[PDB]
Write a protein that binds this ligand. Structure first.
Ligand SMILES: Nc1ncnc2c1nc(Cl)n2[C@@H]1O[C@H](CO)[C@@H](O)[C@H]1O
Length: 385
C-alpha cells in the first residue's frame, strides 16, 4: 500500500515539483491551486507560516519574512564567498551560528532563526502533503534530486531536509541523471551514450554532459551561470516598459515599488504568452497616478531585448564540450530542462549550434526532473520489496 509507494521530488531553487509512477505512467501532481509546480518560498507572518504559492503572492507586503533561495545556502559555511556575495541581494536576514548560516525572521511576533535544511524541509513537507492528498494515503519513500555539482556536504544537508520533513530518502540523484531517465536514455542497450542536458530555470543556468555506459551514468562535465535565468528576461521586459511609460506620459515609475512589482508580474505572464504567440498584451489598470497601461509587445522585440542573454547560454555549452573533451557530433542526445527552454529563440540558438539537430522536449521541461525521479523512486522501492 503506502510502504510499496514512492515519490520523486525535484527540489528546485525557485520551483519544486512532485511526481508519482503508478499503473505504468508518471503523474505530475497538481497542488491545491491546480499548479504542477510550487514556488520554493516560505513566508512567516503574524498568524501563520505560508508555503508555496500563498508565500509567493504576499512577498511584496512581507519581504523581510519571506525566505527563498535556501538551495543557495544549503550545505555551505557562513564564510563561503558564495554566501557572502548572495547575502547582499536578499531582503531577509542571514546570520552566523558557529560558521553555519541561519535565516532570521519574525514569526507570530517572535524572532526565530532557521537552518537552510529546516527551510527546505518545509518545502519538502508541502510536496509530501500534495502527494498524500492526491494518493489518499501517506507516502513516505522519496527520491530527491540535486544539481550534479553539489558536493558531499550539500547532498547530506538535502538528505537531512528529507529526514526533518518525514521522508525516507531512497536516494539523492543528480538533476541531469533524472532528466536522462525521464527520456529513457539509460535503456538504449549496449555502447556508451553521450547526453547533454541544457537546464535554463528561473534563476540558474546549468549545462551537463553525461555518459551512459550500459545503465551506469557518469558526469563528464558541468558548466553554467548560477545567476542567469528566466527572471533576468522579465527584468529586461520591465526596463523596456518603464522607458515606454516614460515616452508616452513623461513620468518615471521606477521608484514606485508597487508599480514595478505589478509590471514585473505582468511581464512574466507576457513572456510566457510569447512562447506560443507572436505578440502579448499588457493590461494594467491604474499602474501609476491613475494611468492605465494597455500595450503590447512582439516576440521579435522581446528577442531583441534579451538577445545578448540568449547568446550567452552558448559559452558554457562550448566550455562543457571542451572540459568533456567531446566535439558536437559526439553528443548523441540533447535534453531541455527548465521552463525558460520553452522560449523559441533559445531552442533555435541551441539547435543551430548543434548543426540543426532535434531536441528532446516532449516532456514539460519544468517537470522532466520530477518525472525521472518518480521513475527511479518506483524502481528503487520495487527492489526494496
Ligand atoms: N512558456 C514559458 N515561456 C517562457 N518562460 C517560461 C515558460 N514557462 C515557464 Cl515556467 N517559464 C519560466 O521558467 C521559469 C521556471 O522554470 C520561470 O522563470 C518562468 O517564467
Amino acid at each position: 500500500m503506502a510502504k510499496a509507494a514512492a515519490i520523486g521530488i525535484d527540489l528546485g531553487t525557485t520551483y519544486s515539483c512532485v511526481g508519482v509512477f503508478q499503473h505504468g505512467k508518471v503523474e505530475i501532481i497538481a497542488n491545491d491551486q491546480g499548479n504542477r509546480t510550487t514556488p520554493s518560498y516560505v513566508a512567516f507572518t503574524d498568524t501563520e507560516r505560508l508555503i508555496g504559492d500563498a508565500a509567493k503572492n504576499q512577498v511584496a507586503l512581507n519581504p523581510q519574512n519571506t525566505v527563498f533561495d535556501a538551495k543557495r545556502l544549503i550545505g555551505r559555511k557562513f564564510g563561503d564567498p558564495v554566501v557572502q556575495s548572495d547575502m547582499k541581494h536578499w531582503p531577509f536576514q542571514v546570520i552566523n551560528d558557529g560558521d553555519k548560516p541561519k535565516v532570521q525572521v519574525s514569526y507570530k511576533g517572535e524572532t526565530k532563526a532557521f537552518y537552510p535544511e529546516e527551510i527546505s524541509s518545509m518545502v519538502l513537507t508541502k510536496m509530501k502533503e500534495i502527494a498524500e492528498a492526491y494518493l489518499g494515503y501517506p507516502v513516505t519513500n522519496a527520491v530527491i534530486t540535486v544539481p550534479a555539482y553539489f558536493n558531499d556536504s550539500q547532498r547530506q544537508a538535502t538528505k537531512d531536509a528529507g529526514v526533518i520533513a518525514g521522508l525516507n530518502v531512497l536516494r539523492i540523484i543528480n538533476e541531469p541523471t533524472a532528466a536522462a531517465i525521464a527520456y529513457g536514455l539509460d535503456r538504449t542497450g549496449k555502447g556508451e551514450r553521450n547526453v547533454l542536458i541544457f537546464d535554463l530555470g528561473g534563476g540558474t543556468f546549468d549545462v551537463s554532459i553525461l555518459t551512459i555506459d550500459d545503465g551506469i551514468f557518469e558526469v563528464k562535465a558541468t558548466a553554467g551561470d548560477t545567476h542567469l535565468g528566466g527572471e533576468d528576461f522579465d527584468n529586461r521586459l520591465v526596463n523596456h516598459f518603464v522607458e515606454e511609460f516614460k515616452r508616452k506620459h513623461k513620468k518615471d515609475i521606477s521608484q514606485n515599488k508597487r508599480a514595478v512589482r505589478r509590471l514585473r508580474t505582468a511581464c512574466e505572464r507576457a513572456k510566457r504568452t510569447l512562447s506560443s504567440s507572436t505578440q502579448a498584451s499588457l493590461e494594467i489598470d491604474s499602474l501609476f497616478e491613475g494611468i492605465d497601461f494597455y500595450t503590447s509587445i512582439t516576440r521579435a522585440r522581446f528577442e531583441e531585448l534579451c538577445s545578448d542573454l540568449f547568446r550567452s547560454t552558448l559559452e558554457p555549452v562550448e566550455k562543457a564540450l571542451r572540459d568533456a573533451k567531446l566535439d558536437k557530433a559526439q553528443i548523441h542526445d540533447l535534453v531541455l530542462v527548465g521552463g525558460s527552454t520553452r522560449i523559441p529563440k533559445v531552442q533555435k540558438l541551441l539547435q543551430d549550434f548543434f548543426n540543426g539537430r532535434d531536441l528532446n522536449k516532449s516532456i514539460n521541461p519544468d517537470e522532466a526532473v520530477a518525472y525521472g525521479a518518480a521513475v527511479q523512486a518506483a524502481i528503487l522501492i520495487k527492489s526494496t520489496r
